[PDB]
């Protein structure tokens, strides 16, 4: 092949041309010191901490920016390499402040560890240090810029990953300062990530300030449920308390980033919590009771109703274990009215075929597409870590992106076809010039957000967009194994519910008003007591009392995503399971156990007693639900297209308008985020602006 041979301390290694000296050392297990180099940002080469000797060369080379020439012997542990790391570490620490005891980065600081692994053990600096004035860049990131080492990782990330050119270097020389120059807030959906990529404590989390130290935390690897992307996270806990949320690397989902809601909405888990069962007293007020009493009331009512009189609505954060258990319980009273708050068209194949409601191209598949079409979606806020993937392809693959919807800033320049859905018909025929771009495209990609399917013409829009994906995947010009049609979900429990057989939307409840309603975490306000028979019996099971608890007759406390081992299916059909970080607060119990307990009291005991047995049931209903971290390909797009043409609905004249036009609509979308005091500060910060940090 074209591989060239280089030696790392005498060990041969075959590397592709363009590989760097730093990357060649990774191939043999050696990690070069670094402060400025990040594997996902541009190469800066300005910290000079990666200098490595090359044999038979008098000059040290920046290992992060030097391509490997053939036949080079990289000396990673010579006297010259080790004397270069001591000098650079000595210059980094000359003006650095003695803030380690009062610095939140202590214990997990790259400057500390690389000072104790590659630097000297004392200082010969006999002068006064520099002092820089702190800067305010929002309510999330605390800045102490005396600790900055001018590595420019935040500058590159803000410009490349986030597409925001707000940070930069002002001045020159020793007085070079990183900041926004003017009083400005770096409020972005990916703003919290500059905390992680900052090797020093210059950028730190403000909510997390001073609460813990790295060594005393316990790391639980779990899944984020604030959206349908399924970002992998680490839940740091200490003495039975959630302290912070961190990204967990997953190349195919979220890289090593997470959105602000995922990172900072955890503090809503500590407010407005349901800790005890409640029933309505004789005065009409909710009063604390016991599990025995609370479940007897619900079992008594459940046994007296059956058929189309017991119905349930599934919320946006429910897990697969609870969804299957509730469906089984209701099916034992001859009830099929299992509904979800999120609407999805049922015409044609409906939910029969998975490919009709999945992101069939996969998130990582956006990097091989050459044209992407977005229909009526603001992916920046609905799926912040799916918009970052688009920008990466828009930045490295020269991707062409077109949007049919409202002109919302996506952090990258796109082509605006308009806003009326009728444009979808022009593209499907040939009138619109953009129709030619899709035919010439080798690997086109069409995305229809589930927010556009909330309109009354969702059936028409889905049919129209799927029609475009049909006139592009069958006509010669596209590789056989490339999916075109895609749906971008925004609710963590949607794909799992549709896989099990839940009816999408609350339409079934509005034509058969039931006399007993289960609100399983439903806090969207889709159904209220104005749409139900008088004296209807409403049972709310959940972890927050936001909108469903105050109208419920029985409140059954449940567990949050950080308090159970639960299965969520992200927008691409990938099943992933959370892990228990802390147990539910008070008398709250695992959600699927409440239904299992209720079934036993009502005389309809479900055939599973343990989590492993409930997941065996999930394998029966849909086998893909127990294939963790695996994406199962869905096929039969042709069948969906045929069944969609049987009924011809018309598109409403109203233009497509995403529910989230600006970032102030992004910080609050569920019970947990609306109960968070950090998201409340973020909303106040992006409307009222920033109209005391020392340590």
């Amino acid at each position: 092949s074209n591989l060239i041979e280089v030696f790392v301390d005498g060990q041969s290694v075959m590397v592709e041309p363009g590989t760097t000296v730093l990357q060649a050392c990774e191939k043999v297990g050696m990690q070069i010191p670094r402060f400025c180099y990040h594997e996902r940002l541009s190469v800066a080469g300005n910290c000079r901490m990666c200098l490595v000797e090359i044999e038979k060369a008098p000059k040290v080379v920046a290992a992060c920016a030097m391509p490997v020439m053939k036949g080079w012997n990289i000396l990673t542990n010579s006297e010259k390499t080790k004397k270069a790391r001591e000098g650079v570490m000595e210059f980094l620490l000359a003006n650095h402040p003695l803030d380690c005891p009062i610095c939140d980065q202590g214990g997990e600081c790259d400057l500390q560890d690389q000072s104790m692994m590659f630097g000297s053990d004392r200082s010969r600096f006999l002068e006064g240090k520099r002092a820089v004035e702190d800067k305010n860049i929002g309510p999330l990131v605390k800045t102490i810029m005396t600790r900055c080492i001018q590595c420019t990782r935040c500058i590159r990330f803000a410009s490349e990953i986030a597409g925001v050119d707000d940070l930069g270097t002002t001045g020159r020389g020793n007085d070079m300062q990183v900041g926004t120059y003017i009083e400005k807030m770096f409020m972005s959906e990916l703003s919290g990530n500059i905390i992680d990529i900052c090797p020093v404590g210059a950028l730190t989390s403000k909510p997390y300030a001073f609460t813990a130290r790295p060594w005393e935390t316990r790391k639980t690897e779990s899944i984020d449920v604030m959206d349908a992307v399924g970002s992998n996270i680490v839940v740091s806990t200490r003495t039975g308390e959630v302290m912070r949320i961190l990204p967990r690397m997953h190349e195919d989902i979220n890289e090593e980033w997470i959105s602000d809601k995922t990172r900072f909405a955890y503090d809503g888990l500590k407010r407005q919590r349901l800790t005890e069962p409640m029933v309505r007293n004789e005065k009409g007020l909710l009063t604390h009771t016991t599990w025995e009493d609370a479940l007897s009331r619900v079992a008594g009512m459940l046994q007296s109703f059956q058929g189309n009189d017991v119905a349930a609505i599934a919320g946006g954060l429910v897990d697969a274990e609870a969804l299957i258990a509730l469906k089984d319980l209701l099916n034992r009273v001859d009830s099929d009215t299992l509904c979800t708050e999120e609407v999805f068209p049922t015409a044609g194949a409906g939910t029969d075929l998975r490919s009709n409601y999945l992101l069939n191209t996969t998130i990582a598949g956006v990097e091989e597409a050459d044209v992407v079409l977005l229909v009526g979606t603001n992916p920046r806020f609905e799926a912040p870590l799916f918009n970052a993937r688009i920008r990466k392809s828009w930045l490295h693959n020269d991707l062409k992106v077109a949007l049919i919807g409202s002109p919302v800033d996506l952090t990258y320049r796109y082509d605006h076809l308009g806003d009326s859905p009728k444009i979808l018909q022009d593209i499907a025929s040939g009138s619109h010039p953009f129709s030619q771009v899709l035919q010439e495209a080798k690997k086109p990609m069409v995305i229809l957000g589930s927010s556009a399917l909330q309109r009354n013409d969702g059936a028409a829009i889905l049919a129209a967009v799927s029609n475009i994906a049909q006139k592009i995947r069958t006509s010669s010009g596209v590789t056989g194994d490339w999916k075109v049609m895609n749906i971008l979900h925004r609710i963590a429990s949607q794909v799992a519910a549709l896989d099990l057989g839940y009816k999408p939307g609350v339409e079934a409840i509005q034509k058969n008003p039931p006399k007993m309603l289960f609100l399983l975490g439903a806090d969207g306000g889709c159904i209220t007591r104005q749409d139900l028979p008088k004296d209807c019996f409403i049972v709310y099971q959940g972890h927050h009392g936001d909108v469903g608890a105050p109208i419920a007759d029985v409140i059954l406390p449940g567990a949050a995503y950080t308090e159970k081992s639960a299965t969520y299916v992200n927008t691409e059909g990938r099943a992933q399971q959370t892990k228990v970080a802390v147990t539910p607060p008070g008398l709250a119990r695992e959600d699927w156990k409440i239904i299992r307990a209720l079934s036993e009291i009502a005389g309809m005991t479900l055939p599973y007693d343990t989590l492993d047995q409930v997941r065996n049931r999930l394998e029966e209903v849909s086998p893909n639900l127990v294939r963790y971290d695996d994406v199962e390909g869905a096929n039969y797009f042709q069948q969906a297209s045929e069944l969609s043409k049987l009924v011809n609905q018309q598109l409403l004249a109203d233009p497509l308008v995403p529910p989230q036009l600006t970032i102030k609509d992004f910080y609050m979308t569920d019970s947990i985020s609306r109960a968070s005091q950090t998201m409340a500060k973020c909303v106040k910060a992006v409307t009222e602006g920033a109209h005391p940090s020392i340590c």
């Binding site: 363009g18 594997e39 190469v43 080469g45 420019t152 270097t169 639980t220 690397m249 190349e251 802390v582």
Partner: protein
């Protein structure tokens, strides 16, 4: 060869009855075999080179006297280190525990060019340095 007069035993290794562990902590547990994820706050990768076996998290409550974190789980601080996944699975099955295995996640190789920072006709040109 050996002269210890060996015998043939054909059955899966099982020592649950001789380890002395109580019954409730062999059957209700769930051991997670995984390679720890990088601490995103740092760049070092030396903590992501060995497999670990941690058990499921049980209840921690608040001590009524001093507010400390009390526990009734004897295996709440039990972390084992293994050189390979098969070594970890073998130990779990030997002690009778139920286990879930997470396959290792390795960063994918990436093409990094410093010359792309200054591109004639590409979006990789950087506006600042």
């Amino acid at each position: 060869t050996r002269d210890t007069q060996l015998i043939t035993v054909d059955e899966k290794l099982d020592i649950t009855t001789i380890t002395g562990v109580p019954e409730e902590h062999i059957k209700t547990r769930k051991a997670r075999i995984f390679v720890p994820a990088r601490n995103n706050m740092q760049s070092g990768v030396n903590n992501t080179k060995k497999w670990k076996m941690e058990f499921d998290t049980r209840e921690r409550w608040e001590n009524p006297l001093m507010g400390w974190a009390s526990t009734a789980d004897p295996l709440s601080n039990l972390v084992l280190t293994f050189s390979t996944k098969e070594d970890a699975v073998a130990f779990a099955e030997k002690n009778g525990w139920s286990y879930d295995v997470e396959e290792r996640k390795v960063p994918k190789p990436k093409s990094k060019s410093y010359g792309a920072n200054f591109s004639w006709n590409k979006r990789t040109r950087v506006s600042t340095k």
